[model samples]
Target: RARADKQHVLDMLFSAFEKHQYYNLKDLVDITKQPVVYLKEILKEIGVQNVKGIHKNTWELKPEYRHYQ
Candidate 1:
């Protein structure tokens, strides 16, 4: 269940996004301690985009969402 607090999940994802531009679902689950599908829902609400190819399934915030380091 992705219950608990939406704010909590957002905060965790936001900070992690700031530090890194991309992350796989497994990693996000590892960090957030939340379910996979739930995290994807939160990311989808924002501008988090997914990628394929070399990295397989990976997530990245859109350019408009954050200033990359």
Candidate 2:
């Protein structure tokens, strides 16, 4: 499948994030109409990879977020 425009996908992401801050690959792929790999790259630059977090297998938003220590 063809990928959507970068800015277009990003706009979708921002809008979606306004509702929830976490997403898995499939969720964003469905939302942005882009491939998983492509979506992942965009997520890294704009959000958190979340190597470990309160949940599993979900990359979440913003650069300066944290759980209680």
Candidate 3:
């Protein structure tokens, strides 16, 4: 198993977000290969904004943090 420290996880998520602006919890679980609970906790730490309703439990980086082109 890989050792996923805070920085490592953040790097992975940032890269993923660069490609896709928004990601649901399940998407993040697949991308990080981490447990949903753990990933959710990490997401909170990284300041990922959660959008409800239309997207249905989706998460996204704040505008200032996003670097997508």
Candidate 4:
């Protein structure tokens, strides 16, 4: 059922990204109310980038994808 509810998860993710520039996997799970594993699959499909090292475990929208005002 990987594809099920996929659009809804994407919608939640975009909404969150619009409000904030950064989020970790856990933050996304909370926002989407979806399982972490499922959310990660969606994130991968959308090309979200993850940061490591000092600012570890954080995810963010790709620069070209951002549309904040």
Candidate 5:
């Protein structure tokens, strides 16, 4: 079991986001290696309002993102 703190989760999300504009929940887990629930909560905290599932248990990044290169 891993303790998913705010800072750690945020770092993972930001780093993963930097790699690609659109990523699903599974990608986040693979990149960050963090649990799905915790990552989702952290993303929501940082204004990631749209984490809708395209398929079963699959969620993608929002269409609009204004972040890193």
Candidate 6:
């Protein structure tokens, strides 16, 4: 199922973030080369929100659960 691949994408994203700290969507695409829809699905799963497009379309991982005990 295509939707299931969201996990794979999420894993890829986390690894990228851990190494680079942050990245724009286009950079993500360059890294994964997956379809936009699929990428969005994974981003949602990883808790990215309030995406913004200043010079580059950037997204930050949500912090709501970052400190959850």
Expressed as tens digits, the lDDT of each residue in 1-69 for candidate 4 is 656588656667678888987788877877767778777776675546666778667776555653532
* C-alpha positional error of residue 69 in candidate 6 after TM-score superposition, expressed in Å: 13
**Which digits, one per residue and each the tens of the lDDT, describe model 1 over residues 1-69?**
335566677667778777887777878887877667777887776645656677477787565654432
Give the TM-score of each candidate. 0.67, 0.65, 0.66, 0.68, 0.55, 0.67
Q: Model 4, which residues run further than 4 Å from truth?
A: 1-4, 53-55, 63-69
Tell me, by TM-score, which candidate is best.
4
Residue pairs in collision within model 5: none
Candidate 1 to truth, TM: 0.67
TM-score of 5: 0.55
lDDT winner between 1 and 5, please give it: 1
**Per-residue C-alpha lDDT of model 5 across residues 1-69, encoded as one tens digit per residue:** 344466556666566667765666767777776567777876664534443466434443443663632
Put down candidate 2 lDDT per residue, 1-69, tens digits, no spaces: 334576577778777777887777777877866667787777776667654565566776555642311
Flag regions of model 1 displaced more than 4 Å. 1-4, 63-69
Question: Of models 2 and 4, which has the larger TM-score?
Answer: 4
Candidate 2 lDDT (Cα, whole model)?
0.68
TM-score ranking, high to low: 4, 1, 6, 3, 2, 5
What tens-digit string does per-residue lDDT give for candidate 6 at 1-69?
865676566677777787866777777888888887778765675556544456555665665665521
After superposition, candidate 6 runs with Cα above 4 Å error: 45-54, 66-69
**Residue ranges of candidate 2 with Cα displaced over 4 Å:** 1-4, 51-55, 63-69
lDDT of 4 at 35: 75
Estimate, for each residue in 5-48, the C-alpha lDDT of model 3 and write its tens digit.
65577787788888977888878777767777777776775556
Residue 14 deviation, candidate 6, in Å? 0.8
